[PDB]
Amino acid sequence: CEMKRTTLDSPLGKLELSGCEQGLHEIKLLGEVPAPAAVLGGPEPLMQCTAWLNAYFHQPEAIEEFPVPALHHPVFQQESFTRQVLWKLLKVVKFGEVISYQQLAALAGNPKAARAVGGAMRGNPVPILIPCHRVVCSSGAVGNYSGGLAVKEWLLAHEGHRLGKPGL
Numbered sequence: 322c323e324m325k326r327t328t329l330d331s332p333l334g335k336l337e338l339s340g341c342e343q344g345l346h347e348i349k350l351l352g353e354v355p356a357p358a359a360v361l362g363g364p365e366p367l368m369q370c371t372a373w374l375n376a377y378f379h380q381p382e383a384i385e386e387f388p389v390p391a392l393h394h395p396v397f398q399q400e401s402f403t404r405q406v407l408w409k410l411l412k413v414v415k416f417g418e419v420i421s422y423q424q425l426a427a428l429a430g431n432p433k434a435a436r437a438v439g440g441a442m443r444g445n446p447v448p449i450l451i452p453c454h455r456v457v458c459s460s461g462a463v464g465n466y467s468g469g470l471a472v473k474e475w476l477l478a479h480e481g482h483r484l485g486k487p488g489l
């Protein structure tokens with residue numbers, strides 16, 4: 322599991338992508354013009370992640386065209402409620418759609434585990450790609466976000482919701 326890394330500038334600030342031949346491990350937010358990854362080339366999961374992020378931010382109408390890379394962070398290597406939540410989220414909630422913590426918990430097999438779902442949103446090593454920003458409050462409120470409220474709102478505004486893109 323030879324770990325390789327590359328960084329990509331984005332509207333949300335610098336993104337550190339890490340992964341190996343087997344899959345992408347993590348997308349880390351370190352804090353208008355499309356940028357390239359600082360280090361080009363494989364492993365394949367990294368190149369796929371870079372193309373997906375570029376499309377997400379700069380060619381969103383075509384986001385469904387880009388393959389989601391294989392994931393190899395340990396959380397995906399074992400069976401757990403967190404993994405089920407993360408995989409369910411990735412599969413069901415599309416660009417522009419939202420789901421409540423409770424609906425995701427129901428989707429993951431336990432309608433009463435909304436709090437566990439919230440915690441799982443932070444155990445998410447690959448934000449944006451696995452759209453944890455689309456998990457919101459049943460009240461209509463945006464809700465918490467590991468990377469800060471402003472980022473969640475920026476992403477939701479980017480996906481068509483009636484929120485203004487905050488200053489980031």
Ligand SMILES: [Zn+2]
Nearest residue numbers: 322341343393
């Ligand atoms: Zn790996």
